[PDB]
Amino acid sequence: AQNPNCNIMIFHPTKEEFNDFDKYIAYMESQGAHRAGLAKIIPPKEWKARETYDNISEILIATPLQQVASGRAGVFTQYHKKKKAMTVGEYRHLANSKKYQTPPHQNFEDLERKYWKNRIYNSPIYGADISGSLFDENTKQWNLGHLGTIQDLLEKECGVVIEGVNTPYLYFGMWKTTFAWHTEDMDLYSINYLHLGEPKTWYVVPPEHGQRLERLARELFPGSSRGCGAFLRHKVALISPTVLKENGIPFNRITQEAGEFMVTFPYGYHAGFNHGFNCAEAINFATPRWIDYGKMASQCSCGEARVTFSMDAFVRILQPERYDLWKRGQ
Ligand SMILES: Cc1nn2c(nc(O)c3cccnc32)c1C#N
Ligand SMILES: [Fe+3]
């Protein structure tokens, strides 16, 4: 068995290896990358996403979200308060203001300590799930707007055409912007490219140990747990590395910098935070190995979880039993 300790693997493909996305995902899995729940991919020195980021200031963040926390420093939930629209240029200026800017720090470990010590006492603002792409349409390799779709994969594996599309999303973050513990919709893969700016620190639980995190969350958020039987689907809960360690939860951490890809694997729980102003692009994707995970994915019927219409067909085909109740919760 490859990678039995479930370490996060880092890959440095050559330009030749970078020419077939599916093939390289499969290669990474042959080396056991998926066991960690997350892998980093450093693109060939020859590669670029686009020529320059000098012309991105006029993108609109229609609904910036302020992330307001409740609880304790290492165990907290966050809710999203809507703010007035701003452009990326205005958002960048806000992120670099005295109120929101990254504080002085010695290194990534120092900033991480500051994050978990003080996150709950500030309410950073970000732009999330903005449909669009910053890849140059002429970038031919690992262009997140030119991947094959999950709908075509499901048709290819299962024989059935379904409605739906699958397009990338942009994220604009600042210091302390927080990604709560979650897996992807339908326990899909995700690929995330950090286009520009300051780093992101990621935490991940190996997929074989996802249920341990779920059990701890039920203990730490007891009211939420009584509310939805899959409340981590709400994407509001945070648990620090110290608390994970105290509770024997296996996990790993890694910092992603501008110019690097991260892939999250089916049922790999992950959470993280931004170090300062940045822009990332992400999209979900599927391989044949995903199908069995999609069949088994937990669903929220709280009503609280966000659902795009594209997910309807995946539940409909892969989880016909659960479809009725999940539909109602939508
Ligand atoms: C832990 C983590 N997950 N995650 C992150 N950042 C994104 O931009 C993102 C986009 C889609 C889905 N998950 C995302 C982080 C960080 N840091
Ligand atoms: Fe994610």
Swiss-Prot record:
Q: How is it modified after translation?
A: Ubiquitinated via 'Lys-63'-linked ubiquitin chains. Deubiquitinated by USP14 with the help of TRIM14 leading to stabilization.
Q: Which UniProt keywords apply?
A: ADP-ribosylation, Chromatin regulator, Dioxygenase, Iron, Metal-binding, Nucleus, Oxidoreductase, Transcription, Transcription regulation, Ubl conjugation, Zinc
Residue span, JmjC domain: 136-302
Q: What is its EC number?
A: 1.14.11.66
Where does this protein reside within or beyond the cell? Nucleus
**Keyword DNA-binding included in the entry's annotation:** no
Give residue ranges for domain JmjN: 8-50
Per UniProt, the enzyme's principal EC class comes to oxidoreductase
PolyADP-ribosyl glutamic acid: residues carrying this PTM: E16, E17
Organism of provenance: Homo sapiens (Human)
Protein family according to the UniProt entry = Belongs to the JHDM3 histone demethylase family.
Q: Which GO terms describe its biological process?
A: cellular response to ionizing radiation; chromatin remodeling; double-strand break repair via homologous recombination; inflammatory response; positive regulation of chromatin binding; positive regulation of double-strand break repair via nonhomologous end joining; regulation of gene expression; regulation of protein phosphorylation
Record's protein name: Lysine-specific demethylase 4D
Query: Where is it mainly found?
Result: nucleus
User: Which positions bind Zn(2+)?
Assistant: C228, H234, C300, C302
What does the entry list as the binding residues for 2-oxoglutarate? Answer: Y126, N192, K200, K235
**What is the reaction catalyzed?**
N(6),N(6),N(6)-trimethyl-L-lysyl(9)-[histone H3] + 2 2-oxoglutarate + 2 O2 = N(6)-methyl-L-lysyl(9)-[histone H3] + 2 formaldehyde + 2 succinate + 2 CO2
Q: Could you say which cofactors this protein requires? A: Fe(2+)
